[PDB]
Each structure stands twice: as structure tokens, then as C-alpha cells.
């Protein structure tokens, strides 16, 4: 996260770290949506251009964390994966269209002050809140600048951007399964996701029922916090029917 701030304790209790067993290293962010299910970006698990194709046994998820590198004894919980599920039409060849994946945990995680699930949006919450100028919140342990890693989880609030501005900012083909967020050059304020923030959540607090909803997943960008560029996020509601099918099937 570029131009963010340190998270408060318990501020993002659905935050999940994807962790490689060997070598022990951070791979991605992710989010807790129930006691058994974790949501992330498909490119965190499968990206052939970089020879990335992880299997369950390569990975752990660490839940309830704040510190990036410390083992947070009596606070974080570490879970193994039962199964990975990637969207069947995830487009790793071109533009990361449908950049979404689910991970089922081998055993349910116990909720605590530091571990708690986020909501997934219904059609009406999405229609009401996914509007240009409305701000969401992005969290992660990724790089603090383009060219430099944080001690603790970072948080930044960013406005959703009008779709024509998103399209005109890039040569990559945008789809309805994406939205973009960030400040414009004239707006003054700054901030963005960066490498290492992949798969973390873009959340909004509904003013109707005072609950946090995950509207997006950190998906892609070109550089970090560049003027005239924006970060792109998987549109979670657009792909919710797939999410539901997987959770019901399994």
C-alpha cells in the first residue's frame, strides 16, 4: 500500500495473509468470508507467465494478523488448505478478467476479537454503493512504493472512479468484471495498492445497516500511485453467482 497508514488493532479482522511454506514468504492478501472459506485473486494462485501454479500443500493462510513478519502468538491462527477453486473463465492470458478464487480451509477457524468475516454484497448494496466518488478501503502488507515493505498492515481509503476515466487511463482492455479506484491528479490526495497487495479486499461500510461489505479484490495496476493511473479491482458482486455455486457444491 502506497501513501496509507498503519491499521488500528482489529480494524480489518477479515484480513488474511497467503503464506508459502517453503521458502517461508508472503504471497498475497485474501479475506475471510466464513469460518471455512477464504476469498482471493486468482492470479495469487495461478499465473503461468511467471511460472506460478500453486497447489494446496504449498500454502498456508494466516488469519488475525497485524505484524507483517512476526509470529503473533495467541492472536493469529494458521490454517491449512483443503481445496483451491479458481474461476473457470479466469483470463490469465490477457487482462486478468474474472480474477477471483476461493480457498476452503481444512478446519474451521475460531472467531475472536481479531478474526471475523466480512459480508459479500447483495445486488442492492452493490447498486447503491458502487458509484463514482464513493470511497472504499484497501488493506495489505505489500510494497510501500513502486521502487520498502511495512512493519504492520497498511490501510488506505480511495474513491471509485468513473468508468470512462478508468478506460482512458490504460491500454489494457477493461471489462464489466472490474472497477477502478484512486484519486485524480487534480484532487491532491494520493494512495494505491502495489505489488504484494494482490488478493486483499476493497471494502465499504454500508450506511444503511452499518456493516462492512467486500466490493472488490486487489487485481492489477501499472506502477504504483502514479499520476493519471488507477488501481483495478475484481467486481465481487458480478461474480457472486459463481461464489455461491462453489460454496453450495462444496
Amino acid at each position: 500500500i502506497v501513501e496509507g497508514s498503519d491499521a488500528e488493532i482489529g480494524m480489518s479482522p477479515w484480513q488474511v495473509m497467503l503464506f508459502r511454506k517453503s521458502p517461508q514468504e508472503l504471497l498475497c492478501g485474501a479475506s475471510l468470508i466464513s469460518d471455512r472459506w477464504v476469498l482471493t485473486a486468482a492470479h495469487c494462485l495461478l499465473y503461468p507467465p511467471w511460472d506460478k501454479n500453486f497447489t494446496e500443500n504449498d500454502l498456508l493462510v494466516r488469519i488475525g494478523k497485524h505484524s507483517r513478519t512476526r509470529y503473533e502468538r495467541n492472536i493469529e491462527k494458521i490454517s491449512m488448505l483443503e481445496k483451491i477453486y479458481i474461476h473457470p473463465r479466469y483470463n490469465w492470458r490477457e487482462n486478468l478478467d474474472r480474477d477471483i478464487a476461493l480457498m476452503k480451509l481444512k478446519k474451521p477457524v475460531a472467531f475472536s476479537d481479531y478474526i471475523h468475516p466480512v459480508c459479500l454484497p447483495d445486488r442492492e448494496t452493490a447498486a447503491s454503493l458502487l458509484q463514482a466518488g464513493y470511497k472504499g478501503r484497501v488493506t495489505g502488507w505489500g510494497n510501500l512504493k513502486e521502487t520498502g515493505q511495512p512493519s504492520v498492515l497498511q490501510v488506505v481509503n480511495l474513491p471509485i472512479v468513473e468508468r470512462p476515466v478508468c478506460k482512458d487511463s490504460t491500454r489494457i482492455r477493461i471489462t464489466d468484471n472490474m472497477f477502478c479506484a484512486g484519486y485524480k491528479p487534480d484532487e491532491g490526495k494520493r494512495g494505491d495498492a502495489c505489488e504484494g497487495d494482490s488478493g486483499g479486499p476493497f471494502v465499504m461500510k454500508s450506511p444503511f445497516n452499518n456493516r462492512w461489505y467486500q466490493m472488490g479484490i486487489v487485481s492489477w495496476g501499472e506502477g504504483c500511485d502514479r499520476d493519471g493511473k488507477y488501481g483495478f479491482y475484481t467486481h465481487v458482486f458480478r461474480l457472486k453467482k459463481w461464489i455461491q455455486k462453489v460454496i453450495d457444491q462444496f
Partner: peptide
């Protein structure tokens, strides 16, 4: 750069 995690989780 990461503090070692309990061996229990890597088995």
C-alpha cells in the same frame, strides 16, 4: 525476513 512459524503448521 519472517519470524519462523511453529513447526506444527509445516508438517
Amino acid at each position: 525476513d519472517f519470524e519462523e512459524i511453529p513447526e506444527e503448521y509445516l508438517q
